[PDB]
Amino acid sequence: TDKLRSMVRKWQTLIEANVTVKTSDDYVLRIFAIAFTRKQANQVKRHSYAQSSHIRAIRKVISEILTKEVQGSTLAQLTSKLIPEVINKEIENATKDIFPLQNIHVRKVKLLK
Amino acid sequence: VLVQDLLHPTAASEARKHKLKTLVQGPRSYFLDVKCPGCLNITTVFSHAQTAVTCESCSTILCTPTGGKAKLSEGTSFRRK
Amino acid sequence: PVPSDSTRKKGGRRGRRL
Amino acid sequence: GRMHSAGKGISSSAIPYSRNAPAWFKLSSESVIEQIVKYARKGLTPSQIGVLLRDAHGVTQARVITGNKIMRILKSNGLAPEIPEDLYYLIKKAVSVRKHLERNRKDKDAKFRLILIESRIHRLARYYRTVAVLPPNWKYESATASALVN
Amino acid sequence: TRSSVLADALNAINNAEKTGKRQVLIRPSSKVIIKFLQVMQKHGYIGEFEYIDDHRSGKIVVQLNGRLNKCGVISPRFNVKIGDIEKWTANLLPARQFGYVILTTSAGIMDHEEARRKHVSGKILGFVY
RNA sequence: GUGAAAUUCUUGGAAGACUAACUACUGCGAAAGCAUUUGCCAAGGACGUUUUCAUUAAUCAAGAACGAAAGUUAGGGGAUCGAAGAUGAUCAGAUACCGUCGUAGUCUUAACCAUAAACUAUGCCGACUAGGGAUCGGGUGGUGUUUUUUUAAUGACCCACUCGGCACCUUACGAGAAAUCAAAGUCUUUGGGUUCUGGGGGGAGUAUGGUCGCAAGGCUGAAACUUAAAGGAAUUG
To answer: Whole-number Å distance, CA B22 to C1' F142?
Structure first.
């Protein structure tokens, strides 16, 4: 919560993704995402915003990875995936060729079934 | 400044301008001659293309549409003109 | 309980006049 | 700047100083005349012919080597269409935005842009009706246009 | 839009003579302007100048030596009729001794004293002093 | 519950809204205006262009469209605030600013209304005239860099430049009553083109007639009489 507030710096862009997904058995969960565009240092210009079709494709690749990891091998094993941020560094790997990021997290854990 | 010539502007400075705002205008875009050596028959290609001008006979590619200058598609060797 | 702001605030437009 | 919008931007071609050669260039007039005739048999608009003979073939400009431009050639070789190209694209955009309004009643901004397009239709079609490249009694209306343009 | 041209020519020339300049480049360069400049050069109020030839209109580059007070255009071209040169030179000349109200007759563009000497009349362009 | 008491409270998953932060002296849109994700639709600007056309243009009386909120009408929605009205005080009076309950409304589908500080309180187009650094979009050059994989490529960033913006900062040659203004400059040395409006203050946007609207309203719009002022810009107790 206050972690999220410490995340929020001005002059930069917020990227949130969200997806609803069932596990193997009848347990459905909506997972979130937070990711901030970081300054790729050697910057002169002060802000480092994104380019707003960047944000579309970044949200889509994040949601894609969120769909690929879940509905395979239930939330026990999916939590075992979520612990060492294999997912978040995969986000880093897939996103970094366009604009890298910072503060890459899924930010929440909650069920709805 | 305040006493000088525009009948003889200096070269790189007059090349520094936008193309329209030069002294007597004449553009900067170029023709050249792309070879993808599968065909030794040369294709004269403009600096920009808007369209995938391919090779002459073997149908593959020579260029992609860009915002700026056309992208020579890496099987390439060329004289300019 | 921070809202994603809605549900118009009491006091009116010109506010709490004192 | 910008008859129906707010910009002032400059963006254009620029014909060179030459009213003669290239002199890297060797070919004859008749060759690219034949190529124009060929692409007209394919059915392209003279902008697209100039584009394609620019990038694909080595032609610099039509009027330097061949003293009749592309639409002079299509008119001269009996392949000129009914309406010229720009007026055609305006009515094409018009019937597009009109159909977009025919399924979407809710967007008034699209209606504004449509009315600007119609104003350009009336001004440009009036220029064409002036110099008799339309028939005097040429009429525009959407009821006719739906079958007219396409 | 660019509704008049000699207007913008004289405007550029006055704004240059104001800010101390020595040369100008004006555009789009009509014949009428060339006549006007030759009229001024005949009295010497500008130095010399030079046409350049693009394939649209040409452009002009003028040397302006030291002596232009104001070179202005009257708009629109009013129909002077010989007895009205006394009117216009009363209004828009600094004195009775110098300055020239130049005017366009059937016999060409020329200043008012040449219209006294050749005894024609017509429309008016402007004024140089 | 407040400034304090008090009216007020004490065994007593649905609904509707809206997209906080990121939100900037930043972008877009003819304005009025617009911030979740994704989709599609139709556009639009700038840049590029050795593609096309050849005056097709600029401003627009008449005439139409659009047009914040609130108000009006027929459903619905009805989660919240809340003109009105009711308390309960305070104050001399207080019909209120303060609280409590709060109907219409607020939200939406189908139509009027066409109004605002619709304010930049600065018509629209055209050029010319001065320095400076930032910043948005785009494009060009580079023995710039990053990224690693094997160099690249890309993508980001750096650098030199160029257009098209929203801006800024200093000046002042100029302008102005001054405040201030890169236009409010290029105006007595008065003419680039063009639509609208004004002629002391009150009477009064009243009367009157016309006009749209169901109405509210808007639009259009005086005289008699009266008076010598009304108004915009700096200093010292």
So the answer is: 23
Amino acid of residue E74: I
D11 in a structural domain: no
Region of A2 on the Ramachandran plot (φ > 0 left; ψ -120 to 50 alpha; else beta): alpha
Residue with tokens 């000349």: E93
- CATH number for the domain that contains residue E96: 3.30.1490.10
**B1 neighbourhood in chain E, CB within 8 Å:** none
Number of H helices, E strands in chain D: 7, 0
Q: Which of D61, D80, D99 is a domain's end point? A: D80
Experimental technique behind these coordinates: cryo-EM
Rounded to the nearest angstrom, the gap between the alpha carbon of residue E62 and the centroid of all alpha carbons in its chain is 13
Residue D34 lies in a domain: yes
Domains recognised in chain B with CATH numbers? 1-81 (2.20.25.100)
- Domain residues for the domain of D64 are 26-80
Here the tokens at position B58 are 């073997």
Resolution for the entry shown, Å: 3.8
Spatial contact of E68 and E46, defined as CB atoms under 8 Å apart: yes
Q: Measure, in angstroms, how far nucleotide F60 C1' is from residue A110 CA.
A: 64
Chain D / chain E CB contacts < 8 angstroms: 4
E93 lies in the same domain as E45? no
> Cβ–Cβ of B25/E52 closer than 8 Å?
no
- Assess whether E55 and E76 both reside in one domain: no
Q: How big is chain B by its Cα radius of gyration, in Å?
A: 18
How many domains does chain E fold into? 2
Of B34, B38, B8, the C-alpha closest to B23 is: B8
Give the separation between CA A89 and CA A104, rounded to whole angstroms.
8
CA atoms within 13 A on the CB side of E50: 10
| CA-to-CA separations, A55 to A45, B7, D127, E83, in angstroms, rounded | 20, 51, 46, 77
Q: Which of residues 28-57 of B touch strand F (CB under 7 A)?
A: 28-31, 46-48, 50
